[PDB]
Amino acid sequence: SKDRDLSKVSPYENIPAKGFTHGVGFDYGVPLSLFPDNAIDPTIANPESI
């Protein structure tokens, strides 16, 4: 049952936070809350449509 693994060794780099100055793409941080994905919709309570 303990069959041999084969696969491939693969290269990597240890960069803890690749891009936080960027204005786009991925938070990374862990929310301090039950349920990994908190959310709410900002668009609903707004004083105006635009």
């Binding site: 803890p16 936080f20 938070d27 941080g29 862990v30 301090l32 900002p42 707004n46 004083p47």
Partner: protein, 188 residues
């Protein structure tokens, strides 16, 4: 109208690498605040704002043109002395003076990390409020959750902190601008 105006004629790709047509994108970007020495560290809450001095976060600068905020906010933290630490939320009611109790004793959401391996702490603080809106620097809700962090053994340390708007976040109601300085200080 009596316009002389004739509309432009210029390509977008020829001169700079990007273009942006909103202030939110500028705010999702994370910026430094102020160094937090000592044990009784105090990060700003989701009410945010009202810093003195003159150095201040970009979010903190955009903050003055508006009146309402809503949504979670993010933190990056870089400890000066490496070693593991813990992250926890709290509130003014939630605190105890038994002098044997400690911050772990409330069973709030928790986060551990050894900084020797991952120097950059990354924590997002959610949005628990009764109200759909929050006037900036509201004091109508005394018990809103507030962040705290501890090394065990309660030793002194400094931290380089930098905040950012969460993806969930927005501002609303446009008040007019604050007076603001622009150039480098003149003379000494």
């Amino acid at each position: 109208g009596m316009d002389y105006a004739k509309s432009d004629s210029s390509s977008l790709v020829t001169t700079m690498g990007e273009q942006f047509r909103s202030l939110r994108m500028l705010t999702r970007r994370s910026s430094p605040t102020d160094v937090l020495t000592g044990t009784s560290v105090t990060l700003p809450g989701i009410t945010i704002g009202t810093d003195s001095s003159l150095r201040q976060s970009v979010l903190n600068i955009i903050s003055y043109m508006y009146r309402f905020t809503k949504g979670s906010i993010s933190y990056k933290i870089i400890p000066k002395i490496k070693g593991d630490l813990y992250i926890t939320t709290s509130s003014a009611d939630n605190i105890e003076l038994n002098s044997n109790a400690y911050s772990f004793d409330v069973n709030r959401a928790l986060h551990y990390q050894n900084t020797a391996l991952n120097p950059v702490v990354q924590v997002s603080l959610p949005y628990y409020c009764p109200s759909e809106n929050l006037v900036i620097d509201s004091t109508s809700f005394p018990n809103l959750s507030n962040l705290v962090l501890t090394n065990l053994e309660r030793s002194s340390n400094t931290y380089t902190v930098l905040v950012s708007a969460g993806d969930d976040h927005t501002f609303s109601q446009l008040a007019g601008c604050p007076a603001f300085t622009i150039g480098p200080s003149r003379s000494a």
